[PDB]
Structure 1
Amino acid sequence: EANLRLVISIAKKYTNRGLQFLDLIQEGNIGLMKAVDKFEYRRGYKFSTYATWWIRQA
């Protein structure tokens, strides 16, 4: 819930290139949950960086 803004901001870049924005943010939320399930801080990286690639893939 706290990271939905990242999904919205990322998806609005892809909205100008066709496809509904709402579907994009829903898929990005799916990818965000996938990243959350796989996130760790033992790596030392920022969560936003890790979630960015997941959201882009979704």
Structure 2
Amino acid sequence: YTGRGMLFLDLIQEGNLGLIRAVEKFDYTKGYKFSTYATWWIRQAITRAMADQARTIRIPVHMVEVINKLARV
């Protein structure tokens, strides 16, 4: 997700918040590796922050998901 109005190092720090979230909600009772669980939370934190901090005029999160959806189609 580099090169979209957010600095590359800034993306790492916001994703880093997602990682600390994931460890508090992870356990061995599920028969799966930590890597599969973590990547969901990493992607969530990065994409939400990108929605909330890239544009000069802030756009609400649900308008942002509308425009990128229509752009791709």
Q: TM-score, normalised by structure 2?
A: 0.56
2:6 corresponds in structure 1 to 19
Larger radius of gyration: 2
In 1: Cα distance, 2:5 partner to 2:31 partner: 36
RMSD: 1.1
User: Which structure 2 segments of 5+ residues have no match?
Assistant: 46-73
Are residue 43 (structure 1) and residue 57 (structure 2) matched? no
**How many angstroms apart in 1 are the aligned matches of 2:7 and 2:22?**
23
TM-score normalised over the length of structure 1? 0.69
> Kindly, what percent of the aligned residue pairs are identical?
78
Structure-2 residue corresponding to 1:32: 19
How far apart are residue 45 of structure 1 and its match?
1.1
Higher RCO, 1 vs 2 (CA within 8 Å, ≥6 residues apart): 1
Tell me how far 1:50 sits from its aligned partner. Answer: 0.5
**Structure 1: any 5+ residue segments left out of the alignment?**
1-13
Q: How many residues align?
A: 45
